[PDB]
Amino acid sequence: KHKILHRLLQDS
Amino acid sequence: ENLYFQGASLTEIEHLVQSVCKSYRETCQLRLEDLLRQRSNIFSREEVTGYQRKSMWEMWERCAHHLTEAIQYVVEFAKRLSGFMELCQNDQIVLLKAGAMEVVLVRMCRAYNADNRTVFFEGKYGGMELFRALGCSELISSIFDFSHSLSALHFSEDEIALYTALVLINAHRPGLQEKRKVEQLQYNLELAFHHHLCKTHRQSILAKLPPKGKLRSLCSQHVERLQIFQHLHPIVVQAAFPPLYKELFSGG
Numbered sequence: 001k002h003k004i005l006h007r008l009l010q011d012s
Numbered sequence: 013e014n015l016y017f018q019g020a021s022l023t024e025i026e027h028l029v030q031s032v033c034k035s036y037r038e039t040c041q042l043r044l045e046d047l048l049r050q051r052s053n054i055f056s057r058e059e060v061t062g063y064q065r066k067s068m069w070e071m072w073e074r075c076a077h078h079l080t081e082a083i084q085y086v087v088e089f090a091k092r093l094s095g096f097m098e099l100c101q102n103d104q105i106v107l108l109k110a111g112a113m114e115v116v117l118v119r120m121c122r123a124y125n126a127d128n129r130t131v132f133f134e135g136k137y138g139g140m141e142l143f144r145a146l147g148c149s150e151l152i153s154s155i156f157d158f159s160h161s162l163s164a165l166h167f168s169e170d171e172i173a174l175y176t177a178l179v180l181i182n183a184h185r186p187g188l189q190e191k192r193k194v195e196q197l198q199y200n201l202e203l204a205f206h207h208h209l210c211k212t213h214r215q216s217i218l219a220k221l222p223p224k225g226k227l228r229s230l231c232s233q234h235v236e237r238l239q240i241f242q243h244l245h246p247i248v249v250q251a252a253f254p255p256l257y258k259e260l261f262s263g264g
């Protein structure tokens with residue numbers, strides 16, 4: 001199972 | 013928290029119009045001019061055969077990777093979108109999981125040439141025969157027919173910008189915690205979009221736009237054909253498919 005969306009949304 | 017979560021004035025609606033058209037321009041992946049400046053660089057019969065000769069798993073990998081890259085710009089558009097970042101993380105994920113593919117399918121009509129029925133794929137323009145090795149002919153003709161329909165509307169970048177914000181900001185997505193907060197943002201973007209169509213004398217395309225069931229059917233067909241490929245090549249998905257793609261279309 002993966003969770004890359006949480007990272008993309010946080011990464012600024 | 014955010015202005016667009018309450019009733020906005022005509023002035024505020026005007027700033028939302030420029031905000032959305034701005035956020036879109038910064039995240040469009042390819043400029044419209046670059047895409048129109050290639051309509052003549054078509055794949056040769058030899059190159060088309062080359063794609064057709066590729067295995068099913070290789071064709072799926074190439075396509076999943078291209079889908080993932082296009083989705084990544086859609087995530088950026090979402091982040092730069094007015095009000096999206098003021099929503100909770102649950103709702104941000106809900107909206108992106110349901111809306112990302114639908115945005116890519118809309119954005120895609122720019123990369124499609126209605127004159128020769130070709131799409132800009134890997135550097136050149138090729139017809140739907142290029143994707144014959146995928147083994148999902150109904151899905152490919154459905155995605156081409158949809159882009160052919162949107163191409164007939166003669167969208168401006170601003171219109172694509174405004175409409176793609178609406179496709180994403182959908183208060184009817186199952187699993188939304190702050191449903192009323194998404195309802196107000198959707199209303200303000202509907203106002204923003206309809207204001208521009210009014211101001212540009214383009215309100216006639218409103219009746220010519222596709223139903224929300226059409227974007228759903230295409231997304232569901234994609235998940236269906238992915239489940240079929242996954243059953244045939246489980247390791248290819250597990251080992252060679254991008255994690256963002258798996259997260260959006262296989263739930264991990």
Ligand SMILES: Nc1csc(N2CCCCC2)n1
Pocket residue numbers: 072075076078079133143155234
């Ligand atoms: N994963 C997946 C399934 S269909 C697809 N497309 C087909 C149209 C061109 C880009 C890639 N990707």
